[PDB]
């Protein structure tokens, strides 16, 4: 894996463009804040921006909001990875592991 | 001429469909428990049964 600290902007872009929910499993695109406040209105979240809030600021209903969200299906990055060989650790000149703030850049490219 | 023994693929085989817990019932196996504790325990439970059969009025 590659992981890091997801900024507000990058979280917003991900949940907008790649917002999919688990409803009777059947992975359903959100496309409407009615579909969020149907399933997650129980926990008080009534919107896309209310869901993005309960993620970006780790809420009392983080577990629920995060497990509701379907695993994001990202594509390969826009200009590539840089990195001639990926499967070294980021520190060495690879890509895998904890890239603190540089995940934001990667993820937007992969979006 | 052959080979003798290997534990290769034996984990994979086991984990594919298996490794499972024995389900743990309430009121467990009261067999191989102290025979004189059992001999008494019967009469205790029969006593409690009579006492609630008396209580039912």
């Amino acid at each position: 894996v590659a992981y890091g600290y997801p900024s507000y902007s990058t979280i917003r872009q991900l949940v907008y463009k790649r917002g999919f929910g688990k409803i009777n499993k059947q992975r359903v695109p959100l496309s409407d804040n009615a579909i969020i406040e149907a399933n997650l209105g129980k926990y008080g979240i009534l919107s896309i921006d209310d869901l993005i809030h309960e993620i970006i600021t780790v809420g009392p209903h983080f577990k629920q909001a995060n497990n509701f969200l379907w695993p994001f299906k990202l594509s390969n990055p826009s200009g590539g990875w840089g990195v001639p060989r990926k499967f070294k650790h980021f520190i060495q000149g690879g890509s895998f592991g904890n890239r603190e703030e540089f995940i934001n850049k990667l993820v937007k490219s992969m979006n | 001429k052959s080979k003798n023994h290997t534990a290769h693929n034996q984990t994979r085989k086991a984990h594919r469909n298996g490794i499972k817990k024995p389900k743990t019932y309430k009121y467990p196996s009261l067999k191989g428990v102290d025979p004189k504790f059992r001999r008494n325990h019967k009469h205790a439970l029969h006593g409690t049964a009579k006492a609630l059969a008396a209580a039912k009025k």
Partner: protein, 169 residues
């Protein structure tokens, strides 16, 4: 490359208030490297690891005067194939970082010493001339210096030329 101030402390466990705040001058291409190297060096000096401590500050350091020509006397240690050896090299450059990446290149070129097998012990600018040891630097410290560039190889953007190209300058 970049030069980074890295101040890490130690975990403040009460019975031990105010741990002694250890500062470094790490050479690294970003913060995620600069902080990993900080821990690498302080694990060779003190009983503390990233779990048992914390980075309290990381700050990029720039050049005081990034357009003054400087003679950087750099002390370095490197793992060779057979053993390890302490070296002193003299880079001439305009920044501390630019001098250091030239050292890393001329260490990789001359002793096959890659990034993992090099420690930058010190990068001190030489104050007064007549302290410059190495001739490959004392060359460029001569009064009223000039020198030509014979065999000037111009480069076409098209396969064919019509003139029989010259190498004059």
């Amino acid at each position: 490359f970049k030069e980074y101030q890295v101040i890490g402390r130690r975990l403040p466990t009460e019975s031990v208030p105010e741990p002694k705040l250890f500062r470094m001058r790490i050479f690294a291409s970003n913060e995620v490297i600069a902080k990993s190297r900080y821990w690498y060096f302080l694990q060779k000096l003190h009983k503390v690891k990233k779990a048992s401590g914390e980075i309290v500050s990381i700050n990029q350091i720039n050049e005081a005067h990034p357009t003054k020509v400087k003679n950087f006397g750099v002390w370095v240690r490197y793992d060779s194939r057979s053993g390890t050896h302490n070296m002193y090299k003299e880079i001439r450059d305009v920044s501390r970082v630019a001098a250091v990446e030239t050292l890393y290149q001329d260490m990789a070129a001359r002793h096959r010493a890659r990034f993992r097998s090099i420690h930058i012990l010190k990068v001190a600018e030489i104050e007064k001339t007549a302290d410059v040891k190495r001739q490959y630097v004392k060359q460029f410290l001569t009064k009223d210096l000039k020198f030509p560039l014979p065999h000037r190889v111009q480069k076409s953007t098209k396969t064919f030329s019509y003139k029989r190209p010259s190498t004059f300058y």
